[PDB]
Design an enzyme around this catalytic site. Sequence first.
Site, PDB file in Angstrom:
ATOM      1  N   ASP A 422      57.741  36.069  43.393  1.00 45.43           N
ATOM      2  CA  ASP A 422      58.415  37.559  43.715  1.00 45.43           C
ATOM      3  C   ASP A 422      58.568  37.984  45.083  1.00 45.43           C
ATOM      4  OD1 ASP A 422      59.119  40.152  42.981  1.00 45.43           O
ATOM      5  OD2 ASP A 422      57.339  40.538  41.829  1.00 45.43           O
ATOM      6  N   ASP A 741      52.656  38.710  42.207  1.00 44.91           N
ATOM      7  CA  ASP A 741      51.512  39.249  42.561  1.00 44.91           C
ATOM      8  C   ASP A 741      51.405  40.524  41.706  1.00 44.91           C
ATOM      9  N   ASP A 745      54.970  41.358  36.733  1.00 43.35           N
ATOM     10  CA  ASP A 745      55.113  40.002  36.556  1.00 43.35           C
ATOM     11  C   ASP A 745      53.909  39.380  35.515  1.00 43.35           C
ATOM     12  OD1 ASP A 745      57.029  39.406  38.755  1.00 43.35           O
ATOM     13  OD2 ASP A 745      55.319  39.772  40.246  1.00 43.35           O
TER      14      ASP A 745
END
Length: 1036
Positions: A422, A741, A745
Amino acid sequence: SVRLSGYCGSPWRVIGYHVVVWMMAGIPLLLFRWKPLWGVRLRLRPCNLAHAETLVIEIWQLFTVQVQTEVLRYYLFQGQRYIWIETQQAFYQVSLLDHGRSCDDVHRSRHGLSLQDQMVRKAIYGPNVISIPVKSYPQLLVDEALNPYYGFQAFSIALWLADHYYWYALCIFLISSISICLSLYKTRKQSQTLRDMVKLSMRVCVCRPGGEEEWVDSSELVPGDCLVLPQEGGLMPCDAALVAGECMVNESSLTGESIPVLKTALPEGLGPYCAETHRRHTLFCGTLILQARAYVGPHVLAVVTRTGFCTAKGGLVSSILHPRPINFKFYKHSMKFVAALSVLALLGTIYSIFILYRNRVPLNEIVIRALNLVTVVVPPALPAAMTVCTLYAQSRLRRQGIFCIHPLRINLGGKLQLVCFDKTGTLTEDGLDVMGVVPLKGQAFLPLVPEPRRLPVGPLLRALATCHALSRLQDTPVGDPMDLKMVESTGWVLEDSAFGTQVPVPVSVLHRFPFSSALQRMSVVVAWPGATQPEAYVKGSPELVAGLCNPETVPTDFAQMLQSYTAAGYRVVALASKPLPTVPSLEAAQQLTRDTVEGDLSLLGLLVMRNLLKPQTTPVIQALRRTRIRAVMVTGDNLQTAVTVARGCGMVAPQEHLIIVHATHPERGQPASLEFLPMESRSRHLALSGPTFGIIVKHFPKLLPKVLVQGTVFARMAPEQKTELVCELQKLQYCVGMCGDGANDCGALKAADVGISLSQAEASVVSPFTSSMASIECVPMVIREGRCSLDTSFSVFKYMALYSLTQFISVLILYTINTNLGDLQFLAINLVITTTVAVLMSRTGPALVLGRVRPPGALLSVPVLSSLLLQMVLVTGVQLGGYFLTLAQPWFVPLNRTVAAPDNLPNYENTVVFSLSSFQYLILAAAVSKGAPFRRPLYTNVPFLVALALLSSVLVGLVLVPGLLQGPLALRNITDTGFKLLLLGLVTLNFVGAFMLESVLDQCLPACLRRLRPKRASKKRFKQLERELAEQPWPP
């Protein structure tokens, strides 16, 4: 893929199966624990699923689930509850029992559930408890201690007692008990940890219709029920939807986000209430409510939506209790490798029977000795060694700051080939930062001032430090991080609202117009002492603010400058102000309309806010790319910023090309079409958004594999598109790590082979891997530990093989000369020399640097098998040479052949063979233990090096020192010393030869097998695609 097979009750059949299994033998029980479907088929008879009293579930794993009555027919499978909806003749999960209802229905539920109507909801949904079941230590023993391995070990213990080898039987029992106790301890401790981690028991007020408020436990909550959240705020017992009021929620408990987040009442609408969409209106279980404000009504209300395992935290706990099977098979060709070693053992066993017959030993002794030999090749310490290896890996990670709930997932770090990152929070800093303000002097943009503090006092600085919608909670402002960072940069202190000069008069907010997503901007009314008129400040997007701003105030370079900023990853917002001729007063300003303030503005300056790249990100990305691991950016952010970060962090080094894959939606009259837009600053990377990814997955399934093989940036990806991408990459036989993180996600981290969360705590359930450190440096750490764990487990299995074959060969030789190794000589060789050295060898930490070479995955590979067959050749040669060399001595006296061991012992042949083999176990432990590339050298393991040295010294004492342990071990004393020195020379020859053999194999066999046989192809679909691309690039 769910298969259900009902088995209605039948008493006579059940008792028949009972008696048959309980009387016939244990073989049916063994094959049932291997294949229990036939067990149920014989024990109970198929029935119409509407009549089932037991179910069989396949997801082709098989479980059997009884069916409970409460009339409600329901069952529980992996925490989830399935109810019998009689009308549709199917077991529907209660999670969906009220799915899809409208936000208007949720709002109408705000009157709660009548207690009479609450019993049905309770029976359906069950208690609001994520109940982690407690297994009794007896039942934990029965689960662990009933394995086929421990059954065979108990069989071996019985045999060794049949032959009077009491010490070796005690050794086997102790090793097996130590194996069982590790498992029991870890399994029980994890359950007791989860049980208290999901522990919650409140007395929560609910709104029973009729106007009365009812106080009930936290477990009496059921979906649709209405909660009265306290003003002071506490833990959230259920997963409710906020219908009235607003409340600060510290969601760190669930997702690990340390900051408070604002929750706002659910909006009335005809769409479906979705916890992922309406995630700013939903309160989750286990999160903490800091404050709760009731702007309308005497108190704040939420409507329970999910309880028990249905809650988000419930799903996270379920994924820990019931993990999906690990993707890699550790024992690649388990049966085939075990069958190679087992055919070796079978040849040896038939030879042993033949020679025992030739020695005229009675048939009962022949069978007992053959069975003892067959048991020699099943080391009692194999499960202990493997579990200890995993525990050491986990402990090393925990000491590095990385926490894996499932230790067996650690070996997947050494299999990783692609890591998805990410962008924001993982690769770049958590929130945006201000690199300056671009003020104006008339109709010209002034040069950027890096920090706004030194800007002269004026409307621009007052707008910077006042034009926002902050709320000071506990002396800490909260809200949109952008506004937080802007006001922090101004340096002003927030005390409606007033702001004091850092070093120049305090400024008051007469009125504030709240921001809206549809308005893309917000405005305020601001006044300060000495001001003739208030100044209204408006912040919004550059083009929209400029549109309302006076055209003669907007420089012509506005659009070009904002586009230049955007190109470099900056995000830009414009600040405008207008003097309001209204008298400066609180009441007068409150009547000003939003349109009046928003219109007729003046462009004062442009504000550029950059999200910065973490200092540790670029080195980690470059290290991964040097290791030939694919670094992929899977973000939900813009494509411009995503590509800028990707170039910045080294995913797209300056020499590689980046091609934008853009897929047009098939508008009327035309189909979907791909167009490629190259950029000018794994040599070709592709960048595509979420819309393009979806269009390619649906309309372009031929071209998806290439896009996935050589795609790098995945921008504007919805949280479900991230999971879709991870699954699509895994379809290409990738081992995908996901270092996302954030909270959004979660699906990607659960789908990924290795899912890592960056800024977490000790006891986190967010993803299988969670670290305490912000940077992505935990990804190289996980990969290095995974490679070390793979190499360590391969070496431990190799040692348990070499060990076992050495003991088998020694017993074969001693059977040939018609003696055995001796009870306490077995106890030593197994309890001390081998268990110690096998549990200590797995203590060596990973190599400090990643390398391009990957650990193997095939225990049946030519390297491993050749290593075993050439180590065993030298072991057997050394033992045979020592034996044949003790015959040539003058003092040698052949053992009394008439008696059988242990009556023969002590004798010279057994003594020599024991000494040599005892040294060989240590030699092999040192030989199989490798350092680089994957582990640290052997000598960095101080306990293991000390064990090797101490055991070698003890064995040298046994060989040399007369009368030392020669009574207990039953060793024959050799008066000669030249023979002892020759024995030590032979042991040293074996040591040198084993290390030389390992070195020569490791250095030559790879090249030998590469030249000897060129690869026909690469079994991996992604390697085939990479070749098919290198021969002809797809984007031409």
